[PDB]
Amino acid sequence: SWLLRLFESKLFDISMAISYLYNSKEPGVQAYIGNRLFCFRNEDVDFYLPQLLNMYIHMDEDVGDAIKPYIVHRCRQSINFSLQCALLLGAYSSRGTKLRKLILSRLAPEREFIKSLMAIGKRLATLPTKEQKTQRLISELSLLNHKLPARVWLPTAGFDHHVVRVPHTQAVVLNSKDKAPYLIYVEVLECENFDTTSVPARIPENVALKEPWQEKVRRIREGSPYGHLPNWRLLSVIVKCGDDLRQELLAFQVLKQLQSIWEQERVPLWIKPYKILVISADSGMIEPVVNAVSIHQVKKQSQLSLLDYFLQEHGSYTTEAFLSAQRNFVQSCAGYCLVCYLLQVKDRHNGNILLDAEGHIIHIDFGFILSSSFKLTTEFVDVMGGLDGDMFNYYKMLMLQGLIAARKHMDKVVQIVEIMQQGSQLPCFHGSSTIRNLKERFHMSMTEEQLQLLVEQMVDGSMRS
Amino acid sequence: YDYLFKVVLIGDSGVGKSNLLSRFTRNEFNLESKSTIGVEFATRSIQVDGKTIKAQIWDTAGRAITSAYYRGAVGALLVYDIAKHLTYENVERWLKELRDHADSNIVIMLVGNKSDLRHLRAVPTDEARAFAEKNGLSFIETSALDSTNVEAAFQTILTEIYRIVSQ
Ligand SMILES: COc1ccc(-c2c(C)nc3c(NCCNC(C)=O)cc(Cl)nn23)cc1S(=O)(=O)N[C@H]1CC[C@H](N)CC1
Ligand SMILES: Nc1nc2c(ncn2[C@@H]2O[C@H](COP(=O)(O)OP(=O)(O)OP(O)(O)=S)[C@@H](O)[C@H]2O)c(=O)[nH]1
């Protein structure tokens, strides 16, 4: 009864549930938990959907059979949920197949919507320059619009909705590569529930530049047929037709937990998880951060040093706008430094770091992490006011605080990674001791004085280049 | 922002340093508490005698080594809990402290916090103010909980500071 005591206590959450489900070899416990999933809030369980579905595929039938009933239940009350399941089910098996087909067995409008987006991207491969690609895209997006507002939605959206219109002229391609990703803007009419609501009616139709997000909404809105409606909102997604997003999703989950951990404790680190959508092992979409551009290009259009740009765009050292931006810089630096360290993120350069209009940095390309095989340049240190600076000392103070916080909730983090490693061929799990090395990096045995030194050492390392 | 005044908060653990900072700068308080690990930073701008200043407040800890942030501080709020005599008792050692690691010409305010705990008072206002003028410190009692004198405390020390006008 001592076990059952815990499961019936307040201490029992979806996190704990999955852990026992993952670890317990007792079929009685597995089945017990399978049933208890229903009592939890839909939102809480959703976050762990990749784990649940992974277990289903790669674990003993007993474990699977306990999870399935809950999944089917959700699938039956939400096609969004249905969609995300089917996509995940497929991507993570290359046991799964039986259930995927049953779920897909309705979604045809959406799957064709998604198919076309993927199809588009693959065609642009024959156009060897960036802007050549852009023009074919813009043209071809216009063909999408010919399809009326459809019984399709962007799973990457925070809410339920119908897609009505694609402002094709605003879309842009992000690089010149063979299977280049591309950014698009999408118009939607919000729902209260997708599953019960009539597709909106067509409203007959009749320039793109560098601008803030709210200025872009104005311009797109004003031009749009549906723009007058209060129901109307603008979304955005990056489409990756030939890039795997399964590592990207994993990192996202890790970032989200760490975000919650640092939120739960009172450490004012700052980071920004961006939503991920796995479509295949081949392909996915990303919800982009608005009002942000790469550091590298920030330096190419400005011709300035990082510090100088801050001063230009926000103000002199005596201004509020600057000090706010500096603070946001320092806090976002400490956050992402810690994330880079814990996940062992590599391939770190100014192409992979974004700067938002408030001064936060944001890392983005999470290939090369963990077993798969961060820089504190003086340009970054300058913005912080220099090594002797109080704000720089504070940067070090935040890192320690955020490290101490992470240790207090280490298990929530390792859980996320350790389950995913299951039966996994991701390059990040290439090692024999991927999860084991991860735990060592938390230094759970260390005293805080020891951690101060380690933090000092970390910073010293980050400067060598 | 005309000026920039750096101020530190120091004192025994539990006296309310961290809540003083959150009340004064974000107008927030909490009964549940997390011990301050190292240092915490918050900022707010005010006007004294017609002049716009900006204060950078540092919430230190009761992790003994927070010393470094002291340097280049014009003012320091040294806080004790009125309802816990020991915290007032160590104020003598806390003044010997400032006379080791900080500017010998720094503005100090003695602060009795948690004045709302009327019935638990373990340090009489007279005894405190006596020590206050026995020394070279300014003195006030605050409650972070009800926000009594919290604004006053900052505005006092900042005004006192500005009285260092150079000719
Ligand atoms: C790993 O891959 C990722 C990961 C994250 C993102 C992403 C997100 C979430 N947010 C933005 C963003 N924000 C500005 C949006 N502007 C407005 C106003 O909405 C601009 C850009 Cl460039 N990326 N980005 C994109 C990609 S990727 O698939 O495109 N590969 C990139 C292509 C550009 C190369 N420099 C790096 C590698
Ligand atoms: N009744 C009353 N209780 C207070 C007051 N201020 C703080 N408390 C309590 O005292 C405790 C002080 O915690 P804290 O906010 O960290 O200040 P501090 O102790 O000076 O800072 P620290 O070095 O220990 S982290 C809090 O639990 C808080 O609930 C107050 O003004 N009135």
**CB distance B37–A404 less than 8 Å?**
yes
A129 touches chain B (CB under 8 A): no
Q: Residue A460 has which token pair?
A: 């010293």
Distance CA A194, CA A34 (A): 27
Q: Which CATH class is domain B1-167?
A: alpha beta
Provide DSSP, A301-342. Answer: HH-S-HHHHHHHHH--TTSHHHHHHHHHHHHHHHHHHHHHHH
A313: left (phi over 0), alpha (psi -120 to 50) or beta: alpha
Contact A236, A183 (CB under 8 A): yes
What dihedral angle (degrees, nearest 10) is formed by the CA atoms of A155, A156, A157, A161? -20
A456 touches chain B (CB under 8 A): no
Q: Residue B42 has which token pair?
A: 């918050």
What dihedral angle (degrees, nearest 10) is formed by the CA atoms of A126, A128, A132, A136? 20
Q: What is the largest CA-CA distance in chain B?
A: 49
Distance CA A14, CA A12 (A): 7
- Residues in chain A, overall count: 465
The alpha carbons of chain B give a radius of gyration, in whole angstroms, of 15
Q: Which helix (H) or strand (E) holds A216?
A: helix A213-223
Distance CA A138, CA A173 (A): 10
Identity at A437, one-letter amino acid code: N
Q: Is B143 in the pocket of ligand 2 (CB under 6 A)?
A: yes
Reference B157, options B73, B62, B68; nearest CA is: B73
B6 touches chain A (CB under 8 A): yes
Tell me which ligand sits closest to the C-alpha of residue B34. 2
Reference A242, options A181, A286, A155; nearest CA is: A181
Q: Which helix (H) or strand (E) holds A249?
A: helix A246-264
Task: Give the distance (Å) from ligand 2 centre to CA of residue B8.
Answer: 16
Reference B42, options A112, A35, A266; nearest CA is: A266
User: CA quadruple B132, B138, B139, B142: dihedral positive or negative?
Assistant: negative
Q: Nearest CB to B1: which of A265, A319, A394? A: A319
The alpha carbons of chain A give a radius of gyration, in whole angstroms, of 24
- B1 Cα to chain A: minimum distance (Å): 5
> Does the annotation list B113 as a binding residue?
yes
User: CA quadruple A216, A173, A187, A87: dihedral positive or negative?
Assistant: negative
- B47 Cα to chain A: minimum distance (Å): 15
- B 43-82: CB under 8 A from A: 43, 45, 56, 63, 68-69
Q: Residue A353 has which token pair?
A: 């770091």
**CB distance A401–B37 less than 8 Å?**
yes
> Does the annotation list B79 as a binding residue?
no
Cβ neighbourhood burial of A12 (10 Å; 0-12, 13-18, 19+): middle
Helices A390-407 + A320-342 axis angle, to 10: 40
Distance CA A278, CA A249 (A): 8
Q: Where are the domains of chain B?
A: 1-167
- A 208-267: CB under 8 A from B: 265-266
Q: Is B144 in the pocket of ligand 2 (CB under 6 A)?
A: yes
Reference B159, options B70, B41, B75; nearest CA is: B75
Task: Give the distance (Å) from ligand 2 centre to CA of residue A345.
Answer: 39
Chain B interface, mutation test: which of A327, A331, A390, A391, most B Cβ atoms within 10 Å? A390
A388 touches chain B (CB under 8 A): no
**Resolution of the experimental structure, in angstroms:** 3.3
Q: Where are the domains of chain A?
A: 1-105, 106-465
Contact B1, A319 (CB under 8 A): yes
What dihedral angle (degrees, nearest 10) is formed by the CA atoms of A43, A47, A50, A53? -40
Nearest CA to ligand 1 atom 34: A351
Helices A96-104 + A49-58 axis angle, to 10: 130
B1 touches chain A (CB under 8 A): yes
Q: Residue A207 has which token pair?
A: 């320039």
Tell me which ligand sits closest to the C-alpha of residue A213. 1
Range B27-30 contact pairs with CB under 8 angstroms and sequence separation of 24 or more: B27/B147, B29/B144, B29/B145, B29/B147
Task: Give the distance (Å) from ligand 1 centre to CA of residue A120.
Answer: 18
A435 touches chain B (CB under 8 A): no
Our separate counts of H helices and E strands in chain A read: 20, 9
Q: Are strands A284-286 and A232-240 parallel, antiparallel or unpaired?
A: antiparallel
Structure determined via: X-ray
- A398 Cα to chain B: minimum distance (Å): 9
In chain A, after which residues does the backbone break, taking C–N over 2.5 angstroms as a break?
94, 105, 206, 373
Distance CA B43, CA B7 (A): 10
Ligand 2 closest atom vs CA B31: 29
Contact A384, A326 (CB under 8 A): yes
- Only one residue has tokens 């050549």, namely A132
Residues of chain B contacting A323 with CB distance shorter than 8 Å: 1, 43
Distance set, CA A445 to CA A352, A404, A449 (Å): 33, 12, 12
DSSP SS3 for B73: coil
Contact A212, A357 (CB under 8 A): yes
Residue of B nearest to A392 (CA): B69
